[PDB]
Symmetry: D2
Subunit: 199 residues, 4 copies
Amino acid sequence: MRITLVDHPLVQHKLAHLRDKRTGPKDFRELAEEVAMLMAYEAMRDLELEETTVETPIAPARVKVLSGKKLALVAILRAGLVMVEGILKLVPHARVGHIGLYQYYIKLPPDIAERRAFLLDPMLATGGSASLALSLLKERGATGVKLMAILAAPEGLERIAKDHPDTEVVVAAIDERLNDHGYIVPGLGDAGDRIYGTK
Amino acid sequence: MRITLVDHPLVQHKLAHLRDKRTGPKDFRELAEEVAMLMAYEAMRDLELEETTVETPIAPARVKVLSGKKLALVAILRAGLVMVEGILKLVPHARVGHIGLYYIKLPPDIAERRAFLLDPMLATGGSASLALSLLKERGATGVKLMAILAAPEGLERIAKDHPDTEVVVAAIDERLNDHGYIVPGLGDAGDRIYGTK
Amino acid sequence: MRITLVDHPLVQHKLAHLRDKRTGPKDFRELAEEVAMLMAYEAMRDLELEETTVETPIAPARVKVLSGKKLALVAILRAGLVMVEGILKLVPHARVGHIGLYRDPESLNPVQYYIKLPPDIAERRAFLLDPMLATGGSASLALSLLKERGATGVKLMAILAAPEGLERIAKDHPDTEVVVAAIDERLNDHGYIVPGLGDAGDRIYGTK
Amino acid sequence: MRITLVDHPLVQHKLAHLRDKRTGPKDFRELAEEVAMLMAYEAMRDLELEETTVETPIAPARVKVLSGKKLALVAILRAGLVMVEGILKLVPHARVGHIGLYRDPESLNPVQYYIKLPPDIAERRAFLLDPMLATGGSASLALSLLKERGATGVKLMAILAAPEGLERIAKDHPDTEVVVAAIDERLNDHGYIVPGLGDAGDRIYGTK
């Protein structure tokens, strides 16, 4: 299982502010969105292109545009929503799906088998939600799905490599462990609550 | 000289739409802002950091933070404005300067700030070179010049006048026609961004 | 029950573009955000203020600021999300809540799958967001969920509403104030607003 | 002359934070965009509409859309830029003009270093944006520029206006309609609005 760590200094810096317990919901949400955008640069380096011609105001021009259907961003409710908003600023034509667990709620774009797909899950703690989500996506015919997380715990990455080995995980950072209550350590607290002000 | 070609399919795709003469002002503006954002990812990969610790809701955490003052984004009017707007989405704390070629306003102590000069179209390199001089006179150092499209001409003008400056570009075009327009380029950046002519 | 019909040229114009079936997800999502922003002007014109003073870089100044805790924006997933995003551009410090409900295609009744609200809800001005008020079943359930948790003076903001839906809320939650951009004709056999604009959610996120 | 005092709690509140000297460039910039958007709501209740039809996914619908060409937003650099950005969030298809003007810190008279306007501005609803209406010298010149190029029915939009500024515009361009967030006391020895909020441009971009 490929684990891609986004290194950029802007990611590290913003991540420092996200962890800082003194950062309020407004800044936390904006930061989380910026991190998502930055991480998407890395996660989308391999987007396939095709050649075509275009007429500029000055003269004809050989150019390259993305091939196939519009990519799909799939958010794991609730915190995953913040990553979608961030990333849509980079790719506004992206189709969006949502998956909420506990039965489960799922809505995906049509023909997801012919779309590059990205699963957004801010905190990869135990990896259970991400795992199940990946299963639902595979089942619908999704392939080559990239799991994007801001923070990941060893226990979580292991969980994914164990159930979906052929999945790439893009993360800003890998922490030490999960505490007595299932939270990533040192992590940043409850992602959802810190994003929407629902402590 | 120092040149960095931004290599990302999103950039290639968006530049394709910018060049297409059918893309209207709204989409052009949004596209230019997105390209500016993407290009900023590379242009800022070398921002310096410094270690420190912070208290998370859960426990102490070792982290790295940007060092020094806040970075400066200097726009060359008018087209440069679109790039400032796009880039600010990534670094909203950045200080902004403006140069119109005549008029110039910059953040204080720019000599102590990582600076980025924004000029969508590096054609003859004339505007950008003058701007770099004005910036050098004011203590600016290690300036990266960011252009969407560049002509070999402008690149050579900058290599000759300011060999110290690094140039970040999205694509290097053929030449300049007998009207100073980049070929194949995309026309008048400003007019296409704002809907003028 | 009180209903506030929002009348503004930009809202009508954009609503025309939202209804047009030729409008794809990107533009539809942006239009919905803009409409929400515009409707927020009227729905928040009654926010309470209190006097205070600040130092200007020129001199002291007597000013007025909002009083009380930050307001709460509660979205009914999925379509409500777009309204919350647009409104946050005006009031970025607002706290956000989410109520997950999807309408059963057969019974046309709401199915709950999630709810999360800011704390001290009874102490904040509350706004419930969901673009389409059809039968009113989902909004009514949401209104109940908010009520049982202490919310009061709730303003339900919808872009389009069917008379049937308005009647359902007046019946179930008379104290609710409903702000809308337009009132349409009726619902069809499948529970869709006519002429309406189709399935908000699918048209916002490009789903089916 | 016609003066609209945008009266809305969100505007008063945000104005309070813009005035407060502790507000940094990032927040100041966001606040100005937000205030500009709220003000645009009033300034554009004016937009003429026309009747037409479209096909919704459900059925045909009679609707209304804006008539004529896209409206023009003309900013007075530098400070005007922030207002254009905020307002674009509501009307993204608007054409943007730019008039470069700065005030000689001596004669308090404006110096012109740039002007670019949308084509056929005579057939577009126009809005001139300049956060601070101090002596009014800048806005007055700007209005003269717009006038000679065919613009008419122009609404000058400012966040703060001083009496001497309104009088200057009332004197040079009486037909101009002004929309403001608040009218202040006077101008100090340096031409700054009292109590105002200091130098707008500098506070927006972090210059000095």
